[PDB]
Amino acid sequence: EVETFAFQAEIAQLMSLIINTFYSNKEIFLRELISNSSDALDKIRYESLTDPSKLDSGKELHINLIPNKQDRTLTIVDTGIGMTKADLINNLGTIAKSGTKAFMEALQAGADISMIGQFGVGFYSAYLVAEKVTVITKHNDDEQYAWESSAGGSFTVRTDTGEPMGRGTKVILHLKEDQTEYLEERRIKEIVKKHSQFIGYPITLFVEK
Numbered sequence: 001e002v003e004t005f006a007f008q009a010e011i012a013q014l015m016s017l018i019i020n021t022f023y024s025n026k027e028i029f030l031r032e033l034i035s036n037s038s039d040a041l042d043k044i045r046y047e048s049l050t051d052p053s054k055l056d057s058g059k060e061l062h063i064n065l066i067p068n069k070q071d072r073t074l075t076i077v078d079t080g081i082g083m084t085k086a087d088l089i090n091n092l093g094t095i096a097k098s099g100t101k102a103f104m105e106a107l108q109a110g111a112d113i114s115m116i117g118q119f120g121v122g123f124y125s126a127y128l129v130a131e132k133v134t135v136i137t138k139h140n141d142d143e144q145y146a147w148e149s150s151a152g153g154s155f156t157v158r159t160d161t162g163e164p165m166g167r168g169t170k171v172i173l174h175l176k177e178d179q180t181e182y183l184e185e186r187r188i189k190e191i192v193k194k195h196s197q198f199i200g201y202p203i204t205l206f207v208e209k
């Protein structure tokens with residue numbers, strides 16, 4: 001059973017701006033998604049200080065980067081707090097509304113797309129390099145869900161029957177045809193060193209076979 005939802009108007013316009021604007025500095029998508037993972041890991045770590053049982057679903061706090069040339073996907077996995085169905089459908093969009101309005105005002109005043117994270121909507125920079133984004137996520141208080149969107153104004157949510165995750169978020173970037181440089185090991189290493197070198201969790205770059 002797949003549910004289809006319309007993005008809020010303002011988030012749809014943000015997605016179209018990210019997809020349609022000419023802007024060559026696309027590599028910042030990775031810093032933004034790693035920042036998302038770090039924030040999610042911070043959150044479950046803090047909550048575990050007063051309720052250790054929140055780590056029964058997994059004690060390790062880490063980030064994995066997994067390129068796949070055969071599928072043309074780059075996957076960012078973290079064992080953070082995860083997202084609930086209400087997060088995916090309602091809560092995150094409510095936050096992204098005011099962040100989008102502020103980001104677009106800043107752009108018209110002279111800011112550039114690389115500053116998207118200062119407005120809390122860095123997740124959407126995934127569409128600099130991805131034609132489709134799939135998010136698998138499991139929060140301690142909810143079921144495992146798959147969220148998916150190819151932009152165009154709509155996203156889907158369903159219950160995920162795939163391999164159980166324990167706790168956390170997997171972001172699967174289905175890369176655009178001309179963006180395969182981000183499946184190369186040396187390229188990913190360069191970007192992580194440049195933009196994410198002080199992240200407070202182990203980042204493991206998987207090698208392909």
Ligand SMILES: Cc1cc(O)c2cccc(F)c2n1
Pocket residue numbers: 036083088092093096123135147
């Ligand atoms: C971090 C983050 C922020 C958002 O607005 C999202 C919206 C839909 C799905 C996501 F995974 C999201 N993640």
